[PDB]
Structure 1
Amino acid sequence: GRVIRNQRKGRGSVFTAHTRLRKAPAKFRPLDYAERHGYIRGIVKEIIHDPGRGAPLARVVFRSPYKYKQITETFIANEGMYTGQFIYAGKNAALTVGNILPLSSVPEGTVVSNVEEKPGDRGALGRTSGNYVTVVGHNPDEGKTRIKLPSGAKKVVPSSSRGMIGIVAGGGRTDKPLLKASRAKHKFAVKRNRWPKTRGVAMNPVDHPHGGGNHQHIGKASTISRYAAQGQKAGLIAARRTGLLRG
Protein backbone atom coordinates (compact mmCIF):
# COMPACT_ATOMS: atom_id res chain seq x y z
CA GLY A 1 0.00 0.00 0.00
CA ARG A 2 0.85 3.69 0.30
CA VAL A 3 1.55 6.11 3.14
CA ILE A 4 -1.63 6.89 5.06
CA ARG A 5 -2.90 10.35 5.98
CA ASN A 6 -2.09 9.70 9.66
CA GLN A 7 1.55 9.08 8.73
CA ARG A 8 1.64 12.03 6.30
CA LYS A 9 0.42 14.46 8.97
CA GLY A 10 3.74 14.13 10.82
CA ARG A 11 6.02 15.31 8.00
CA GLY A 12 4.84 18.92 8.22
CA SER A 13 4.19 20.23 4.67
CA VAL A 14 0.50 21.23 4.33
CA PHE A 15 -0.27 19.94 7.85
CA THR A 16 1.61 22.64 9.76
CA ALA A 17 -0.26 25.07 12.00
CA HIS A 18 -1.18 28.59 10.94
CA THR A 19 1.22 31.30 12.03
CA ARG A 20 0.52 34.68 10.41
CA LEU A 21 -2.52 35.95 12.33
CA ARG A 22 -1.15 34.66 15.65
CA LYS A 23 0.95 37.34 17.31
CA ALA A 24 2.65 36.22 20.53
CA PRO A 25 2.57 33.05 22.66
CA ALA A 26 0.46 33.19 25.81
CA LYS A 27 2.59 32.49 28.88
CA PHE A 28 3.54 33.99 32.23
CA ARG A 29 6.47 36.23 33.04
CA PRO A 30 9.79 34.48 33.73
CA LEU A 31 10.19 33.64 37.40
CA ASP A 32 12.31 36.30 39.07
CA TYR A 33 13.12 37.89 42.42
CA ALA A 34 10.00 40.08 42.54
CA GLU A 35 7.60 37.17 42.04
CA ARG A 36 9.61 34.84 44.29
CA HIS A 37 9.82 37.25 47.24
CA GLY A 38 7.11 39.93 46.93
CA TYR A 39 4.75 41.07 44.18
CA ILE A 40 4.89 43.18 41.03
CA ARG A 41 2.02 45.17 39.49
CA GLY A 42 1.10 45.18 35.82
CA ILE A 43 -1.53 47.08 33.87
CA VAL A 44 -3.94 45.26 31.56
CA LYS A 45 -4.02 47.44 28.47
CA GLU A 46 -5.53 45.18 25.82
CA ILE A 47 -7.91 42.24 25.62
CA ILE A 48 -7.47 40.72 22.17
CA HIS A 49 -8.82 37.80 20.18
CA ASP A 50 -6.27 35.14 19.29
CA PRO A 51 -7.02 33.61 15.86
CA GLY A 52 -7.36 29.86 16.34
CA ARG A 53 -7.79 30.07 20.12
CA GLY A 54 -11.23 30.21 21.69
CA ALA A 55 -9.98 32.02 24.79
CA PRO A 56 -9.27 35.77 24.63
CA LEU A 57 -5.74 36.90 25.45
CA ALA A 58 -4.67 39.82 27.64
CA ARG A 59 -1.81 42.19 26.84
CA VAL A 60 -0.49 43.34 30.23
CA VAL A 61 2.48 45.69 30.63
CA PHE A 62 4.83 45.39 33.61
CA ARG A 63 7.87 47.42 34.64
CA SER A 64 11.45 46.21 34.46
CA PRO A 65 12.99 46.28 37.97
CA TYR A 66 16.52 46.31 36.57
CA LYS A 67 16.31 48.85 33.74
CA TYR A 68 14.18 51.73 32.46
CA LYS A 69 11.87 49.77 30.17
CA GLN A 70 8.24 48.71 29.83
CA ILE A 71 7.78 44.95 29.38
CA THR A 72 4.64 43.75 27.61
CA GLU A 73 3.41 40.23 28.34
CA THR A 74 0.58 38.18 26.83
CA PHE A 75 -1.54 36.31 29.37
CA ILE A 76 -4.61 34.14 28.94
CA ALA A 77 -7.50 36.32 30.09
CA ASN A 78 -9.69 35.09 32.93
CA GLU A 79 -13.40 35.84 33.08
CA GLY A 80 -13.71 39.26 34.72
CA MET A 81 -10.47 40.89 33.58
CA TYR A 82 -10.88 44.32 32.01
CA THR A 83 -8.73 46.99 30.38
CA GLY A 84 -7.14 49.35 32.89
CA GLN A 85 -7.09 46.74 35.65
CA PHE A 86 -4.01 46.41 37.85
CA ILE A 87 -3.07 42.76 38.29
CA TYR A 88 -0.44 41.62 40.78
CA ALA A 89 1.94 38.71 40.18
CA GLY A 90 4.00 37.37 43.05
CA LYS A 91 4.14 35.51 46.33
CA ASN A 92 2.56 38.29 48.41
CA ALA A 93 -0.17 39.11 45.89
CA ALA A 94 -3.81 39.19 46.96
CA LEU A 95 -6.35 36.49 46.11
CA THR A 96 -8.05 38.49 43.35
CA VAL A 97 -9.16 37.42 39.87
CA GLY A 98 -6.32 38.02 37.44
CA ASN A 99 -3.57 37.91 40.06
CA ILE A 100 -0.79 35.35 39.61
CA LEU A 101 0.22 33.53 42.79
CA PRO A 102 2.21 30.43 43.67
CA LEU A 103 0.01 27.53 44.73
CA SER A 104 1.49 27.61 48.24
CA SER A 105 -0.03 31.07 48.82
CA VAL A 106 -3.60 30.13 47.82
CA PRO A 107 -6.14 28.35 50.05
CA GLU A 108 -7.66 25.00 49.19
CA GLY A 109 -10.71 25.12 46.94
CA THR A 110 -9.24 27.97 44.91
CA VAL A 111 -9.57 27.56 41.15
CA VAL A 112 -6.63 28.71 39.02
CA SER A 113 -5.62 28.81 35.36
CA ASN A 114 -2.45 28.60 33.24
CA VAL A 115 -0.90 26.48 35.98
CA GLU A 116 2.78 25.55 35.80
CA GLU A 117 3.67 21.87 35.86
CA LYS A 118 7.18 22.87 36.99
CA PRO A 119 8.20 26.26 38.44
CA GLY A 120 9.50 28.28 35.51
CA ASP A 121 7.81 26.85 32.41
CA ARG A 122 5.41 29.85 32.39
CA GLY A 123 2.14 27.88 32.43
CA ALA A 124 0.96 24.53 31.11
CA LEU A 125 -2.39 23.47 32.59
CA GLY A 126 -5.96 24.70 32.21
CA ARG A 127 -5.39 27.03 29.27
CA THR A 128 -8.54 26.64 27.13
CA SER A 129 -11.73 28.67 27.40
CA GLY A 130 -13.99 27.89 30.34
CA ASN A 131 -11.49 25.55 32.01
CA TYR A 132 -9.81 25.78 35.40
CA VAL A 133 -7.59 23.85 37.80
CA THR A 134 -8.74 23.32 41.39
CA VAL A 135 -6.28 23.49 44.30
CA VAL A 136 -7.45 20.47 46.30
CA GLY A 137 -4.58 19.67 48.68
CA HIS A 138 -1.46 21.02 50.33
CA ASN A 139 1.62 19.37 51.86
CA PRO A 140 3.85 22.04 53.47
CA ASP A 141 6.49 19.57 54.69
CA GLU A 142 7.37 18.31 51.20
CA GLY A 143 6.38 21.58 49.53
CA LYS A 144 3.77 19.83 47.38
CA THR A 145 0.31 20.77 46.12
CA ARG A 146 -2.42 18.46 44.85
CA ILE A 147 -4.53 19.91 42.03
CA LYS A 148 -7.46 18.69 39.95
CA LEU A 149 -7.29 19.16 36.16
CA PRO A 150 -10.28 19.65 33.80
CA SER A 151 -10.03 15.97 32.72
CA GLY A 152 -10.87 14.82 36.25
CA ALA A 153 -7.22 13.97 36.89
CA LYS A 154 -5.50 14.78 40.16
CA LYS A 155 -1.82 15.66 40.01
CA VAL A 156 0.91 16.66 42.45
CA VAL A 157 2.98 19.72 41.53
CA PRO A 158 5.60 21.73 43.44
CA SER A 159 4.09 24.50 45.55
CA SER A 160 6.23 27.16 43.83
CA SER A 161 4.25 26.69 40.61
CA ARG A 162 2.26 29.78 39.68
CA GLY A 163 -1.33 30.10 38.50
CA MET A 164 -3.69 32.93 37.62
CA ILE A 165 -6.67 33.07 39.98
CA GLY A 166 -10.00 32.53 38.23
CA ILE A 167 -11.73 30.83 35.30
CA VAL A 168 -10.65 31.31 31.69
CA ALA A 169 -12.99 33.58 29.73
CA GLY A 170 -15.01 32.28 26.80
CA GLY A 171 -16.87 29.49 28.57
CA GLY A 172 -19.72 27.68 26.88
CA ARG A 173 -18.25 28.06 23.38
CA THR A 174 -19.06 24.48 22.34
CA ASP A 175 -22.72 24.74 23.42
CA LYS A 176 -23.70 26.63 20.26
CA PRO A 177 -23.93 24.23 17.29
CA LEU A 178 -21.74 24.91 14.25
CA LEU A 179 -24.83 24.75 11.98
CA LYS A 180 -23.09 25.13 8.60
CA ALA A 181 -20.11 23.39 7.02
CA SER A 182 -18.51 26.78 6.42
CA ARG A 183 -18.41 27.48 10.15
CA ALA A 184 -16.30 24.36 10.71
CA LYS A 185 -14.23 25.31 7.64
CA HIS A 186 -13.53 28.76 9.12
CA LYS A 187 -12.82 27.17 12.51
CA PHE A 188 -10.16 24.81 11.15
CA ALA A 189 -8.70 27.00 8.37
CA VAL A 190 -7.19 29.20 11.09
CA LYS A 191 -5.79 26.19 12.96
CA ARG A 192 -4.45 23.57 10.51
CA ASN A 193 -5.28 21.43 7.48
CA ARG A 194 -7.43 18.71 9.06
CA TRP A 195 -10.87 19.50 7.57
CA PRO A 196 -12.76 17.87 5.94
CA LYS A 197 -12.00 14.30 7.05
CA THR A 198 -12.68 11.29 4.85
CA ARG A 199 -13.66 7.99 6.47
CA GLY A 200 -11.26 5.10 6.02
CA VAL A 201 -14.07 2.69 5.14
CA ALA A 202 -14.84 4.80 2.06
CA MET A 203 -11.26 4.33 0.82
CA ASN A 204 -9.25 1.67 -1.03
CA PRO A 205 -7.03 -0.99 0.59
CA VAL A 206 -4.02 0.94 -0.72
CA ASP A 207 -5.18 4.06 1.16
CA HIS A 208 -6.13 2.91 4.67
CA PRO A 209 -6.58 -0.36 6.65
CA HIS A 210 -10.39 0.08 6.58
CA GLY A 211 -10.59 0.52 2.81
CA GLY A 212 -11.99 -1.98 0.34
CA GLY A 213 -14.76 -4.54 0.19
CA ASN A 214 -18.07 -4.80 -1.63
CA HIS A 215 -19.72 -3.35 1.49
CA GLN A 216 -18.31 -0.58 3.66
CA HIS A 217 -17.21 -2.27 6.88
CA ILE A 218 -14.19 -2.42 9.18
CA GLY A 219 -13.68 -6.17 8.77
CA LYS A 220 -12.30 -6.78 12.27
CA ALA A 221 -12.35 -5.23 15.73
CA SER A 222 -11.87 -1.46 15.78
CA THR A 223 -9.72 -1.70 18.93
CA ILE A 224 -6.01 -1.75 18.05
CA SER A 225 -3.12 -2.66 20.36
CA ARG A 226 -0.81 -0.05 21.88
CA TYR A 227 2.33 -1.64 20.37
CA ALA A 228 0.97 -1.84 16.82
CA ALA A 229 3.27 -0.98 13.93
CA GLN A 230 3.52 2.50 12.45
CA GLY A 231 0.49 2.83 10.18
CA GLN A 232 -1.43 -0.03 11.80
CA LYS A 233 -3.04 2.42 14.27
CA ALA A 234 -6.36 3.52 12.79
CA GLY A 235 -9.38 3.61 15.07
CA LEU A 236 -9.64 3.02 18.82
CA ILE A 237 -6.08 2.76 20.17
CA ALA A 238 -5.36 0.78 23.36
CA ALA A 239 -8.99 0.95 24.47
CA ARG A 240 -9.73 -0.48 27.91
CA ARG A 241 -13.50 -0.37 27.37
CA THR A 242 -15.86 0.51 24.53
CA GLY A 243 -19.53 1.26 23.98
CA LEU A 244 -21.90 3.79 25.46
CA LEU A 245 -22.02 3.97 29.24
CA ARG A 246 -25.43 4.30 30.89
CA GLY A 247 -24.36 7.24 33.06
Structure 2
Amino acid sequence: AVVKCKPTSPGRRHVVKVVNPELHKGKPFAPLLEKNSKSGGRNNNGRITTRHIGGGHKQAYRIVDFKRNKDGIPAVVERLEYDPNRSANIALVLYKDGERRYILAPKGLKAGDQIQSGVDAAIKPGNTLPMRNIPVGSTVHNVEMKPGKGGQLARSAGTYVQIVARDGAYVTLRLRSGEMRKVEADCRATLGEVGNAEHMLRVLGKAGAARWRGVRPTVRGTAMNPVDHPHGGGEGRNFGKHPVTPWGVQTKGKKTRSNKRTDKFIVRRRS
Protein backbone atom coordinates (compact mmCIF):
# COMPACT_ATOMS: atom_id res chain seq x y z
CA ALA A 1 0.00 0.00 0.00
CA VAL A 2 1.02 3.60 -0.64
CA VAL A 3 2.11 4.51 2.89
CA LYS A 4 2.78 8.22 3.43
CA CYS A 5 5.58 8.74 5.96
CA LYS A 6 5.67 11.28 8.78
CA PRO A 7 7.78 14.53 8.63
CA THR A 8 10.19 13.59 11.42
CA SER A 9 13.16 15.12 9.62
CA PRO A 10 14.14 17.01 6.50
CA GLY A 11 14.24 14.55 3.61
CA ARG A 12 12.00 11.93 5.21
CA ARG A 13 9.15 14.43 5.12
CA HIS A 14 8.33 13.91 1.45
CA VAL A 15 9.14 10.26 0.83
CA VAL A 16 6.17 8.06 -0.07
CA LYS A 17 6.67 4.29 0.21
CA VAL A 18 4.79 1.36 -1.26
CA VAL A 19 4.58 -1.50 1.22
CA ASN A 20 3.64 -5.04 0.21
CA PRO A 21 3.14 -7.63 3.01
CA GLU A 22 2.02 -10.21 0.45
CA LEU A 23 5.64 -10.29 -0.72
CA HIS A 24 7.70 -13.15 0.68
CA LYS A 25 10.46 -11.55 2.77
CA GLY A 26 12.93 -14.42 2.46
CA LYS A 27 16.17 -14.70 0.51
CA PRO A 28 16.04 -15.26 -3.29
CA PHE A 29 15.99 -18.68 -4.98
CA ALA A 30 19.62 -19.75 -5.56
CA PRO A 31 19.09 -21.94 -8.69
CA LEU A 32 18.01 -18.95 -10.77
CA LEU A 33 20.74 -16.39 -10.15
CA GLU A 34 24.02 -15.08 -11.54
CA LYS A 35 26.03 -11.91 -11.05
CA ASN A 36 25.00 -8.61 -12.57
CA SER A 37 27.76 -6.03 -12.28
CA LYS A 38 27.01 -2.41 -13.09
CA SER A 39 28.57 -0.87 -16.18
CA GLY A 40 28.40 2.76 -15.11
CA GLY A 41 27.49 3.67 -18.67
CA ARG A 42 30.92 2.65 -19.95
CA ASN A 43 31.15 0.62 -23.17
CA ASN A 44 34.06 -1.39 -24.61
CA ASN A 45 36.06 1.78 -25.27
CA GLY A 46 35.59 2.73 -21.63
CA ARG A 47 34.05 6.09 -22.51
CA ILE A 48 30.74 7.02 -20.94
CA THR A 49 28.12 6.67 -23.66
CA THR A 50 25.07 7.09 -21.43
CA ARG A 51 25.35 9.75 -18.73
CA HIS A 52 23.80 9.87 -15.25
CA ILE A 53 24.74 6.25 -14.52
CA GLY A 54 26.79 5.12 -11.55
CA GLY A 55 26.64 3.94 -7.96
CA GLY A 56 23.51 2.34 -6.60
CA HIS A 57 23.02 -0.74 -4.45
CA LYS A 58 24.57 -3.99 -5.62
CA GLN A 59 22.02 -6.38 -7.09
CA ALA A 60 21.91 -9.79 -8.76
CA TYR A 61 20.18 -10.78 -11.97
CA ARG A 62 17.21 -13.11 -11.50
CA ILE A 63 16.76 -15.15 -14.67
CA VAL A 64 13.04 -14.78 -15.29
CA ASP A 65 11.30 -16.66 -18.08
CA PHE A 66 9.79 -14.47 -20.77
CA LYS A 67 9.82 -17.19 -23.43
CA ARG A 68 7.44 -19.64 -21.73
CA ASN A 69 7.91 -22.75 -23.88
CA LYS A 70 6.43 -25.18 -21.34
CA ASP A 71 3.20 -26.73 -22.59
CA GLY A 72 0.51 -29.02 -21.20
CA ILE A 73 2.03 -28.65 -17.75
CA PRO A 74 0.13 -27.06 -14.83
CA ALA A 75 2.10 -24.72 -12.56
CA VAL A 76 1.58 -23.39 -9.05
CA VAL A 77 2.64 -19.91 -7.97
CA GLU A 78 4.68 -20.68 -4.86
CA ARG A 79 5.35 -17.16 -3.63
CA LEU A 80 6.09 -13.61 -4.77
CA GLU A 81 9.72 -12.51 -4.92
CA TYR A 82 11.03 -8.96 -5.17
CA ASP A 83 12.98 -8.22 -8.35
CA PRO A 84 15.38 -5.22 -8.12
CA ASN A 85 15.94 -5.26 -11.89
CA ARG A 86 12.30 -4.62 -12.77
CA SER A 87 9.49 -2.28 -11.83
CA ALA A 88 7.05 -5.14 -11.46
CA ASN A 89 7.02 -8.11 -9.09
CA ILE A 90 7.89 -11.68 -10.04
CA ALA A 91 6.18 -14.86 -8.90
CA LEU A 92 8.18 -18.03 -8.36
CA VAL A 93 6.21 -20.68 -10.23
CA LEU A 94 6.50 -24.39 -9.53
CA TYR A 95 5.60 -26.82 -12.31
CA LYS A 96 3.87 -30.18 -11.92
CA ASP A 97 7.08 -32.13 -12.55
CA GLY A 98 9.34 -30.05 -10.34
CA GLU A 99 11.27 -27.51 -12.40
CA ARG A 100 11.03 -23.97 -11.03
CA ARG A 101 11.05 -20.64 -12.86
CA TYR A 102 10.17 -16.98 -12.47
CA ILE A 103 7.48 -15.20 -14.47
CA LEU A 104 6.50 -11.55 -14.55
CA ALA A 105 3.79 -11.27 -11.89
CA PRO A 106 0.39 -10.46 -13.45
CA LYS A 107 -2.29 -8.38 -11.70
CA GLY A 108 -4.73 -10.71 -9.98
CA LEU A 109 -2.15 -12.95 -8.35
CA LYS A 110 -1.52 -14.50 -4.94
CA ALA A 111 0.54 -17.36 -3.50
CA GLY A 112 -1.31 -20.47 -4.62
CA ASP A 113 -2.86 -19.58 -7.96
CA GLN A 114 -2.89 -22.16 -10.75
CA ILE A 115 -1.49 -21.44 -14.21
CA GLN A 116 -0.18 -23.21 -17.29
CA SER A 117 0.89 -22.55 -20.87
CA GLY A 118 0.26 -24.05 -24.28
CA VAL A 119 -2.31 -23.45 -27.00
CA ASP A 120 -5.25 -24.95 -25.14
CA ALA A 121 -5.21 -23.17 -21.77
CA ALA A 122 -8.43 -21.35 -20.86
CA ILE A 123 -8.37 -17.55 -20.72
CA LYS A 124 -7.17 -16.93 -17.17
CA PRO A 125 -4.66 -14.30 -15.92
CA GLY A 126 -1.21 -15.84 -16.07
CA ASN A 127 -1.60 -18.30 -18.94
CA THR A 128 0.58 -18.06 -22.03
CA LEU A 129 -0.94 -18.92 -25.40
CA PRO A 130 -0.53 -17.75 -29.04
CA MET A 131 -2.28 -14.56 -30.16
CA ARG A 132 -4.76 -16.31 -32.45
CA ASN A 133 -6.26 -18.40 -29.65
CA ILE A 134 -6.73 -15.29 -27.53
CA PRO A 135 -10.11 -13.64 -28.28
CA VAL A 136 -10.29 -10.22 -29.94
CA GLY A 137 -10.41 -7.28 -27.55
CA SER A 138 -8.82 -8.89 -24.50
CA THR A 139 -6.01 -7.48 -22.35
CA VAL A 140 -2.57 -9.09 -22.62
CA HIS A 141 1.03 -8.36 -21.63
CA ASN A 142 4.57 -9.62 -22.28
CA VAL A 143 3.78 -9.78 -26.00
CA GLU A 144 6.45 -11.45 -28.12
CA MET A 145 7.54 -9.71 -31.35
CA LYS A 146 9.11 -12.66 -33.17
CA PRO A 147 7.54 -16.14 -32.88
CA GLY A 148 10.08 -17.35 -30.33
CA LYS A 149 12.03 -14.20 -29.47
CA GLY A 150 10.97 -14.28 -25.83
CA GLY A 151 8.89 -11.24 -24.95
CA GLN A 152 9.11 -7.54 -25.73
CA LEU A 153 6.11 -5.28 -25.22
CA ALA A 154 4.33 -4.55 -21.91
CA ARG A 155 6.99 -5.56 -19.38
CA SER A 156 6.56 -2.99 -16.62
CA ALA A 157 4.27 -2.35 -13.66
CA GLY A 158 0.63 -1.73 -14.56
CA THR A 159 1.16 -1.85 -18.32
CA TYR A 160 -0.87 -3.98 -20.71
CA VAL A 161 -1.53 -4.57 -24.41
CA GLN A 162 -4.98 -4.60 -25.96
CA ILE A 163 -5.44 -6.83 -28.99
CA VAL A 164 -7.67 -4.78 -31.27
CA ALA A 165 -7.90 -6.77 -34.49
CA ARG A 166 -6.81 -10.05 -36.05
CA ASP A 167 -6.62 -9.55 -39.80
CA GLY A 168 -5.78 -13.18 -40.51
CA ALA A 169 -2.00 -13.35 -40.75
CA TYR A 170 -1.43 -10.49 -38.31
CA VAL A 171 -2.75 -9.20 -34.99
CA THR A 172 -3.14 -5.48 -34.34
CA LEU A 173 -2.23 -4.42 -30.80
CA ARG A 174 -3.14 -1.14 -29.16
CA LEU A 175 0.08 -0.46 -27.31
CA ARG A 176 0.55 1.45 -24.08
CA SER A 177 1.71 4.64 -25.81
CA GLY A 178 -1.20 4.80 -28.23
CA GLU A 179 0.97 3.06 -30.80
CA MET A 180 -0.82 0.47 -32.94
CA ARG A 181 1.61 -2.08 -34.33
CA LYS A 182 0.80 -5.30 -36.17
CA VAL A 183 2.46 -8.45 -34.83
CA GLU A 184 2.42 -12.03 -36.14
CA ALA A 185 -0.43 -14.26 -34.97
CA ASP A 186 1.95 -17.03 -33.84
CA CYS A 187 3.58 -14.91 -31.13
CA ARG A 188 3.10 -16.11 -27.55
CA ALA A 189 1.56 -13.69 -25.06
CA THR A 190 0.45 -13.81 -21.42
CA LEU A 191 -2.96 -12.60 -20.21
CA GLY A 192 -3.73 -9.98 -17.58
CA GLU A 193 -2.09 -6.67 -16.71
CA VAL A 194 1.25 -6.68 -14.91
CA GLY A 195 1.00 -6.39 -11.13
CA ASN A 196 2.49 -3.89 -8.66
CA ALA A 197 0.62 -1.15 -10.52
CA GLU A 198 1.07 1.36 -7.67
CA HIS A 199 4.82 1.52 -8.39
CA MET A 200 4.20 4.85 -10.13
CA LEU A 201 2.97 6.61 -6.98
CA ARG A 202 6.23 6.03 -5.11
CA VAL A 203 8.27 9.21 -4.69
CA LEU A 204 11.94 9.17 -3.72
CA GLY A 205 11.86 12.19 -1.41
CA LYS A 206 15.62 12.52 -0.87
CA ALA A 207 18.38 13.43 -3.32
CA GLY A 208 20.27 10.42 -2.03
CA ALA A 209 17.24 8.25 -2.72
CA ALA A 210 17.88 8.64 -6.44
CA ARG A 211 21.55 7.87 -5.83
CA TRP A 212 21.08 4.32 -4.58
CA ARG A 213 18.71 3.80 -7.52
CA GLY A 214 21.67 4.49 -9.76
CA VAL A 215 20.81 7.95 -11.06
CA ARG A 216 23.79 10.31 -10.89
CA PRO A 217 23.43 14.13 -10.80
CA THR A 218 22.31 15.72 -14.09
CA VAL A 219 23.74 19.17 -14.82
CA ARG A 220 21.81 21.75 -16.85
CA GLY A 221 23.19 23.30 -20.01
CA THR A 222 23.00 26.95 -18.93
CA ALA A 223 25.11 26.07 -15.89
CA MET A 224 28.03 25.09 -18.11
CA ASN A 225 30.55 26.99 -20.21
CA PRO A 226 30.31 27.40 -24.02
CA VAL A 227 32.71 24.56 -24.77
CA ASP A 228 30.94 21.84 -22.77
CA HIS A 229 27.41 22.51 -23.99
CA PRO A 230 25.81 24.39 -26.91
CA HIS A 231 24.00 26.56 -24.36
CA GLY A 232 26.55 27.62 -21.72
CA GLY A 233 28.19 31.04 -21.51
CA GLY A 234 26.45 34.23 -20.41
CA GLU A 235 27.10 36.76 -17.65
CA GLY A 236 24.22 35.29 -15.69
CA ARG A 237 21.49 32.88 -16.76
CA ASN A 238 21.33 33.91 -20.41
CA PHE A 239 19.80 31.93 -23.24
CA GLY A 240 18.92 32.66 -26.86
CA LYS A 241 19.99 29.44 -28.53
CA HIS A 242 17.51 26.82 -29.66
CA PRO A 243 17.13 23.91 -27.20
CA VAL A 244 19.34 21.02 -28.30
CA THR A 245 21.20 17.97 -27.06
CA PRO A 246 24.82 18.20 -25.95
CA TRP A 247 25.63 17.09 -29.50
CA GLY A 248 23.77 19.65 -31.61
CA VAL A 249 20.69 17.51 -32.27
CA GLN A 250 17.53 19.60 -31.79
CA THR A 251 15.23 18.60 -28.92
CA LYS A 252 11.78 19.81 -27.85
CA GLY A 253 9.88 18.70 -30.94
CA LYS A 254 12.19 16.86 -33.34
CA LYS A 255 11.35 13.37 -34.56
CA THR A 256 14.26 10.93 -34.69
CA ARG A 257 12.08 8.07 -35.95
CA SER A 258 13.79 6.58 -39.01
CA ASN A 259 14.17 2.86 -39.69
CA LYS A 260 12.01 2.31 -42.78
CA ARG A 261 12.18 -1.48 -42.40
CA THR A 262 9.68 -1.38 -39.55
CA ASP A 263 7.39 1.14 -41.22
CA LYS A 264 5.40 -1.79 -42.60
CA PHE A 265 4.14 -2.81 -39.16
CA ILE A 266 2.89 0.49 -37.76
CA VAL A 267 -0.78 1.34 -38.22
CA ARG A 268 -1.05 4.60 -36.27
CA ARG A 269 1.75 6.45 -34.50
CA ARG A 270 1.55 8.07 -31.07
CA SER A 271 -0.19 11.45 -30.91
- Identify the TM-score tier after normalising by the shorter chain: 0.7 to 0.9
Q: CA deviation at 1:28?
A: 2.5
Q: Does 1:93 find its partner at 2:121?
A: yes
In 2 relative to 1, CA 22–71 (structure 1 residues): closer, same or farther, beyond 3 Å? same
Q: CA deviation at 1:177?
A: 3.7
Q: Does 1:26 find its partner at 2:64?
A: yes
Q: CA deviation at 1:16?
A: 6.8
Tell me the number of residue pairs that the alignment of Structure 1 and Structure 2 aligns. Answer: 213
Structure 2 Cα separation of the partners of residues 104 and 42 of structure 1: 23
1:178 aligned to 184, 204, 212, which one? 204
Shifted more, 230-239 versus 55-64: the winner is 230-239
Cα RMSD (Å) of the superposition? Answer: 3.1
Structure 1 Cα separation of the partners of residues 161 and 141 of structure 2: 6
Partner residue, 1:108: 136
TM-score (norm 1): 0.74
Deviations 1:192-216 (A, max 9, x none): xx32211121011232222222132
CA contact (8 A) 2:94 2:100 kept: yes
Structure 2 Cα separation of the partners of residues 17 and 156 of structure 1: 39
Partner residue, 2:146: 118
1:233 aligned to 216, 241, 249, which one? 249
In 2 relative to 1, CA 107–17 (structure 1 residues): closer, same or farther, beyond 3 Å? farther
Partner residue, 1:67: none
CA contact (8 A) 2:61 2:85 kept: no
Q: Does 1:217 find its partner at 2:238?
A: yes
Partner residue, 1:59: 92
Structure 2 Cα separation of the partners of residues 207 and 184 of structure 1: 25
Structure 2 Cα separation of the partners of residues 148 and 111 of structure 1: 10
Aligned-residue identity in percent = 31
Name structure 2 gaps, 5 residues minimum.
Answer: 1-40, 257-271
Structure 2 Cα separation of the partners of residues 45 and 205 of structure 1: 58
Q: Does 1:43 find its partner at 2:82?
A: no
CA contact (8 A) 1:78 1:167 kept: yes
Structure 1 Cα separation of the partners of residues 57 and 203 of structure 2: 27
Q: In the TM superposition, what are the counterparts of 1:141-180 in structure 2 within 5 Å?
A: 142=169, 144-180=170-206
Deviations 1:164-211 (A, max 9, x none): 11011111322344333233333x23xxxx322111210112322222
CA contact (8 A) 1:114 1:163 kept: yes
1:204 aligned to 225, 240, 243, which one? 225
Structure 1 Cα separation of the partners of residues 200 and 50 of structure 2: 30
Higher normalized helix content (fraction of residues): 1
In 2 relative to 1, CA 180–231 (structure 1 residues): closer, same or farther, beyond 3 Å? same
Structure 2 Cα separation of the partners of residues 55 and 9 of structure 1: 28
The one-letter amino acid paired with 1:9 is I
TM-score (norm 2): 0.68
In 2 relative to 1, CA 28–62 (structure 1 residues): closer, same or farther, beyond 3 Å? farther
Q: CA deviation at 1:19?
A: 9.2
The one-letter amino acid paired with 2:218 is K
Deviations 1:133-156 (A, max 9, x none): 00111123x2x1111111110111
Q: SS of the residue aligned with 2:48?
A: helix
Name structure 1 gaps, 5 residues minimum.
Answer: 65-69, 225-229, 241-247
The one-letter amino acid paired with 1:107 is P
